[PDB]
Design a binder for this molecule. Structure first.
Ligand SMILES: Cc1ncc(C[n+]2c([C@@H](O)CCC(=O)O)sc(CCOP(=O)(O)OP(=O)(O)O)c2C)c(N)n1
Ligand SMILES: Cc1ncc(C[n+]2c([C@@H](O)CCC(=O)O)sc(CCOP(=O)(O)OP(=O)(O)O)c2C)c(N)n1
Ligand SMILES: [Mn+2]
Ligand SMILES: [Mn+2]
Lengths: 556, 556
C-alpha cells in the first residue's frame, strides 16, 4: 500500500543480491533520494560502510578499495551532479579493471525533463565507460523480485572487469515507518534470502587458450617486459625471466625487483638498443608502462612477434605490433607457459644497467625530488605498500630507484588522473590494513585536498609525502614554450600544506634535510594515523636531474 | 610537413571563430595534449584568460562567468579524466542555460582503445547533456579551414542555451618551432581574418508568439509566481503584477522585492490556499522554484490554465498542469502582454503575509543561521550582488527574508549541486566586478574547498559566509530516520575553516555575535579581497526554527 515501504523492499533486494557476488565494502555519500538504497545498505550486516561528502573522492575511495581487495565495491549517491562526480573513478576503473558497482539514485520518470529540482537525464550518462549499464524501471510489485535479482546477477556474474552503472529511480514518499508492503512480494524468492549464492548463476570465464607453440618460441632470443601486475606476479615473472635467460625490463609498477634497473636511462644508450634488436620475440606481462625511453623502445622495436599477457581485455600495445594479445591471469599463464633453463643471450645491457644505477648513486646526496625518488627504497614501511602518485614522481621513481621484488605498488595509471590520488590512497590503505607510503606532487594534493578528511581514518600509519616544487613541473620536463610555461603550464599556486594538515588534525613535518626526513618517518610510523610530510624543493631540479642523468648514461 | 605547426593552425581557427560569437572569457587548465588549443588561446588578444588546477572547479568558474555575462564562455582542458570533471558544470549549464564552450583535447583515433596513457573514449562521453556536440576529425589540410569554422559557426550560432562539447584530437609532435605549414590553408579564408563576423551567419531565433487571448485572461482572477530571472526582470514583474492586482509570490531568486514575503510560511495556512483556489489562471515567470510550500501549492492548485514564461526550453512545470509553456525573454514577454490596471482581488493573503513576517521578526535576536537568513537584506553590499548557496541557506532566505527588488541574486539551482559553489562564486564576482556576498554551508565549503585558490583573486571585495552547523543539516529538516541520521545523512565532519583561509592568505573571522559580525562585514568591504567569515551555529537550531515558524503561521 505504502510507496515508501516498497521502495525500501525493492532496494533491499538490490543490495542483498550484491552480497552474493563478493561486495563487502559500500561507499556512501549523503542525499535524500538515495534513502531506500542507503537504509537497506546500512541495515545489511554483510557490508563495511565508508562515507565521504565529495562524490568524486567517494568514487576514488571505492576505486582504492577495489584496487587492493580485487573485489567489487558498491557506491551509493543521490541524483544529480553527485552522479556526474563518479565519472573519473568510473573511467579509471574502465581502463585498469576495478569493479565499481555504482548504485545511483534517480528521480522517477514523471519528474524528468520538467524543471524539477535536482532531476537530470541519468541513464546512459557514462556512455560506454561502464562494462554494463542497468537502467532500472520505476519500482512496482507488478515486476517480480526474481526479475530484479536476475538482472543484477547477470551484470555482476558476467562482470569480467570495470564498473557497473545501476540507475535506481525512486518516487516519493521516501520516508515513513515500514509497512508490510512488498513483503509477500519479497517472499516470492523463498529461501534465497538465507542462501549464500546468486539467484541466477551466470559466470562464464574469459580466457585465452594456452599458446601451443611456446616451447618453440622460448628457444629464441627473447625479451621480457613487465608492466603493472600483482606483487606475487612480479616475483614469479622475475624468476621466469631469469630462467629463460631473457633480459627483464621491469616497470616501477611490476614489483619484479627490476634486475636491470634504470631502464629509462640505459635504454637511451645505442649499445643497449643495438643489442635489443637481436630480439626475435618480446613477451610483455602487464601494461600501462611508465617510462618514456621504454615506450619509445616498445614503439621502435621490430621482433617477429610481440606478445602482451594481461587479465584486462582489449589491445594494450599502442605501437600495434604483429603478434598476440593474451587474456589471462599472469600467474596462471606463467604455469601454462613455463620457462626452461637456458643460457642468457644479453652481455652488454647488464653492464650498462649497473653503470646507470652507479651514476644515479653519485648524485644521491642533494636534497631533491629526484634523489628522494632514488632513495624511496630506504623509506618503504615494513610489510606495507606504496601508492605512487602521477606526473614526475612515478617517472622519477621508475628511472632512479630499484624497488624490492614483491613489494606491493599501487597507482592510478589507467588514465593517470591527478584528480583522485589522496582519496584513492585512503581506499588502498583501508582495504589491506597495511602501513602505507603515498607520494604525490603539490598540484595533485591540492586537486583532491578535501580527501585529507578521509585520511583522518586509517587502520595503520599512512605517510603522505607532498612533493612541493611549486607547480606541475612535468611541464618543465616537456619542451613547453618558455614564454607561456609558467602561467599556462606550471600554474604555481604558491602554497604550503601545514594549514591543510592542521585543519584536519593530521601530524605534519616539513623536513629541510635527510636527517629531519628520517626523523619525521620514525615519528610517523608509530601510530595508526596519517602524517603529512611536505618536502619543499626547487621547481626544475627534478626535471633537470633526470635529463642530465639521461645524457650522461647515453654516452657510456 | 610539420604536424605540430599545423596542429596550432587548426586550433587557431577554432579559437578565432569563437571570438565572433562573443566569447571573451576562456578558462584554462594545464596539459600537454591541450597545447595547440592553449597556445592559440594565449596568443589571441581577444580573450580574458583564467586558470585553475581543478578541472571541475574550472567548469564552475566558467559557469559563474557565463551566469553573469550571459555570453558564451570557453573552457580548455587536456585529455583524460580532466574532461570528465567538466560534467558537473556542463549538466548545470544544460538546465539553467549558461553557454559553456568546452574545448576538450584528445588523443588521435590511432591511440584510442589501445592502452595508451591518458587516452579514453571521449566523443559522446557527456551523452545528451550538451546542447551540441562536435567531434572533430583528425586534423588535416585535406579538410578546408572553411568547413572547420562553419561547423563551429553552426554550433555557436544556433546555440539557444546550454553547453557545446567540442572534442579536439591532436597527434604528436605537439611542440616544435612554428612552421609555415597550414598558413596558405588558413589564408583560404581571405579577409575573414580581419572581420568581426562569423564565417557562416546562422542564428535563427526561438520564441513564442503573442498570446492572442491575453486580453481575456488578464481580466480573470490570476496569480503571479516569480521564479529565477534577471535583476531588471524582477522589478518589471513586480510592477506588472501590482498593476494587475494579482498576488505576487516571489521566489528568493526573483528579485521582485517579494511584496508578500515568507510565502513558504503563509502558504501553509489553509486560509491562503482556500483564497488561492479562486485563481482561474496562474502566470509563472522564470522557474526553479525554491520553497517546499510553494512547490506543494503548485502541485495542488487547479486553475483553468497554468502558464510558464521563461527563456529556457522544455516543460518547467513538474506538476504537469493544463496550460501553456511560453519561450521568450521575460522582459520582452511582458511588453508583448502588457498589464491592465485592475483592482486586487486577494484580501486574506496580504493579511497573512504581514503576520508571517512579524512572526519571523519576533525571533530575529538569536545568533542562528535562520536569523542570519532573515537579516541578510540588511547586510547586502552596496551596488553588489548575492551568491546564494544550496541546501538550507537558499531555503531559509526564501522563507524568512525579504530581498530588495532588482538587487542581483545568483545561484546554482538547476540541479542544486553542492559541488561547485565556491568556484562559481569566483566567476560570478569576476564577471561583474561587483562587491559580492556569497553564503554556503560547511559541506559545500569542504566540497569545493580548493576553490579558495581562486578567491585570492577578485576585483572587488568578496565576503564568503561559511555557515558551519557541522554537517548536512537539511537532513534534520527532512523526516530522516534518527538512528542512521548522523552517520549516513548528516555526516558531520567536525572542522572549522580558519586554517583553510590561512592556507590561501585570506582574512578570516569567527564572530560570536551580531556586533562582531557587522564588525567583520565593515572591514571586509574595504579591500578588493576575499574575506572568509565562519558562522558556527548549533546543528539543528536552523531547521527547527523553520519548522516552528511553519507551525505558527499555519495556525493563524
Ligand atoms: C584530472 C587531471 N587534470 C590534468 C592532468 C594533466 N596533468 C598531468 C598529466 O600529464 C599526467 C602525466 C602522467 O602521469 O601520465 S601532470 C599535471 C601537473 C601535476 O602537478 P603536480 O601534482 O604538482 O606534480 P609535478 O608535475 O611532479 O610537479 C597535469 C595537470 C591530469 N593528468 N589529470
Ligand atoms: C554534488 C552533490 N552531492 C550531494 C548533494 C545532495 N545534498 C543536498 C541536496 O538536497 C540539495 C538540495 C537543494 O539545494 O535543493 S544538500 C546536502 C548537504 C549540504 O550540507 P551543507 O553545505 O553543510 O549545508 P546545510 O544542509 O544547510 O547544512 C547534500 C549532500 C547535492 N545536491 N550535490
Ligand atoms: Mn608539483
Ligand atoms: Mn551544514
Amino acid at each position: 500500500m505504502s510507496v515508501s515501504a516498497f521502495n525500501r523492499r525493492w532496494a533491499a533486494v538490490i543490495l542483498e543480491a550484491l552480497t552474493r557476488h563478493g561486495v563487502r565494502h559500500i561507499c556512501i555519500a549523503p542525499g535524500s533520494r538515495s534513502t531506500p538504497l542507503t537504509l537497506a545498505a546500512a541495515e545489511n550486516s554483510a557490508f563495511i560502510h565508508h562515507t565521504h561528502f565529495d562524490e568524486r573522492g567517494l568514487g576514488h575511495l571505492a576505486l582504492g578499495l577495489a584496487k587492493v581487495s580485487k573485489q567489487p565495491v558498491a557506491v551509493i549517491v543521490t541524483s544529480g551532479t553527485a552522479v556526474a562526480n563518479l565519472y573519473p573513478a568510473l573511467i579509471e576503473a574502465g581502463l585498469t579493471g576495478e569493479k565499481l558497482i555504482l548504485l545511483t539514485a534517480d528521480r522517477p520518470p514523471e519528474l524528468i525533463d520538467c524543471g524539477a529540482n535536482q532531476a537530470i537525464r541519468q541513464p546512459g550518462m557514462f556512455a560506454s565507460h561502464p562494462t554494463h549499464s542497468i537502467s532500472l524501471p520505476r519500482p512496482t510489485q507488478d515486476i517480480p523480485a526474481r526479475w530484479l535479482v536476475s538482472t543484477i546477477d547477470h551484470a555482476l556474474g558476467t562482470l569480467h572487469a570495470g564498473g557497473v552503472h545501476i540507475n535506481c529511480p525512486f518516487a516519493e514518499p521516501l520516508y515513513g515507518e515500514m509497512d508490510d508492503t512488498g513483503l509477500s512480494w519479497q517472499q516470492r524468492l523463498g529461501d534465497w534470502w538465507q542462501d549464500d549464492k546468486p539467484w541466477l548463476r551466470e559466470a562464464p570465464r574469459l580466457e585465452s587458450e594456452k599458446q601451443r607453440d611456446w616451447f618453440f618460441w622460448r628457444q629464441k632470443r627473447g625479451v621480457v617486459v613487465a608492466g603493472r601486475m600483482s606483487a606475487e606476479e612480479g616475483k614469479k615473472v622475475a624468476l621466469w625471466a631469469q630462467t629463460l635467460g631473457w633480459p627483464l625490463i621491469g616497470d616501477v609498477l611490476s614489483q619484479t625487483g627490476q634486475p636491470l634497473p634504470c631502464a629509462d636511462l640505459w635504454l637511451g644508450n645505442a649499445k643497449a638498443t643495438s643489442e635489443l634488436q637481436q630480439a626475435q620475440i618480446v613477451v610483455q606481462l602487464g601494461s600501462s608502462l611508465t617510462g618514456k625511453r621504454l615506450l619509445q623502445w616498445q614503439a621502435s622495436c621490430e621482433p617477429e612477434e610481440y606478445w602482451i599477457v594481461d587479465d584486462i581485455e582489449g589491445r594494450l600495445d599502442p605501437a600495434h605490433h604483429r603478434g598476440r594479445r593474451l587474456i589471462a591471469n599472469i600467474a596462471d599463464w606463467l604455469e601454462l607457459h613455463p620457462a626452461e633453463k637456458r643460457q642468457p643471450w644479453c652481455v652488454e645491457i647488464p653492464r650498462l644497467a649497473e653503470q646507470a644505477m652507479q651514476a644515479v648513486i653519485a648524485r644521491r646526496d642533494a636534497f631533491g625530488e629526484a634523489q628522494l625518488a632514488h632513495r624511496i627504497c630506504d623509506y618503504l614501511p615494513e610489510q606495507g605498500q606504496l601508492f605512487v602518485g602521477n606526473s614526475l614522481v612515478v617517472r622519477l621513481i621508475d628511472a632512479l630507484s630499484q624497488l624490492p621484488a614483491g613489494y606491493p605498488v599501487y597507482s592510478n595509471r589507467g588514465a593517470s588522473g591527478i584528480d583522485g590520488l589522496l582519496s584513492t590512497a585512503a581506499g588502498v590503505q583501508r582495504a589491506s590494513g597495511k602501513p602505507t607510503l603515498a607520494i604525490v606532487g603539490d598540484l595533485s594534493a591540492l586537486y583532491d585536498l578535501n580527501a585529507l578528511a578521509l585520511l583522518r581514518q586509517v587502520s595503520a600509519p599512512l605517510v603522505l609525502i607532498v612533493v612541493n616544487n611549486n607547480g606541475g613541473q612535468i611541464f618543465s620536463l616537456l619542451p613547453t614554450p618558455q614564454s607561456e610555461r609558467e602561467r599556462f603550464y606550471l600554474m604555481p599556486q604558491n602554497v604550503h600544506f601545514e594549514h591543510a594538515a592542521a585543519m584536519f588534525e593530521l601530524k605534519y613535518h616539513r623536513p629541510q634535510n635527510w636527517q629531519e626526513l628520517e626523523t619525521a618517518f620514525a615519528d610517523a610510523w608509530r601510530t595508526p594515523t596519517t602524517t603529512v610530510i611536505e618536502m619543499v624543493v626547487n621547481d626544475t631540479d627534478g626535471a633537470q636531474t633526470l635529463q642530465q642523468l639521461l645524457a650522461q648514461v647515453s654516452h657510456l
